[PDB]
């Protein structure tokens, strides 16, 4: 879904 897209980026900017 589109409403989860923003969450993906949030796990992405949560760095390694």
């Amino acid at each position, epitope marked *: *879904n*589109w*409403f989860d*897209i*923003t*969450n993906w*980026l*949030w796990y992405i*900017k*949560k760095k390694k």
Partner: antibody
Amino acid sequence: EVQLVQSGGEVKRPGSSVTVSCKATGGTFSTLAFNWVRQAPGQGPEWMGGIVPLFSIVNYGQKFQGRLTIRADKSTTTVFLDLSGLTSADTATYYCAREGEGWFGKPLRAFEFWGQGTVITVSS
Amino acid sequence: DVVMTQSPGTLSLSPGERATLSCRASQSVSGGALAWYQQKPGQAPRLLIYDTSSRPTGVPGRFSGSGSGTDFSLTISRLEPEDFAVYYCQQYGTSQSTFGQGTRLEIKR
């Protein structure tokens, strides 16, 4: 506090196109979803579409495709709503609603922050 | 697509009484992505419950949401005078989100 301030209400001729703007302040803008929701007199809210400004990812309701455009300006944290081919069925209050933020970030998806609404009357 | 139907159309109850509003989806909502909103006359809706059961900050604890599928009950344990309003449910588990038709919670007399 996160605040969304919309443009003023307007009357539009039938068949024309209306643009509504939503100025977003308060906090993070670019990495969250902004949605447009409208409500006709005496009716319930209807979701129209949304934007993630970061890469201008859009999602349009099926019933509005061909007539609806959603845009977003990261330089001014403003999201836009464009609706063409107006008819009396589009007379409504239009709301710009942002998904919530929970603890250290996370998108909540649910629409936590709302603009004051823009009253659009399609008539003659 | 998924249709959201709320019940009853109008719910008439007494201040201080317990309230339960039902919302049913025409197909199962994935991952409980269901929110409840409150709307008073002239104001935008206000989010009361998201992700089936999670309550945003600022919403009083007398509000709770449950479901686990297609039947989401918003419960208000103790109807305060300010709680009489129209309530909407919304599913957002798919890429096309939709709202229910509303339940009007009004004062009984």
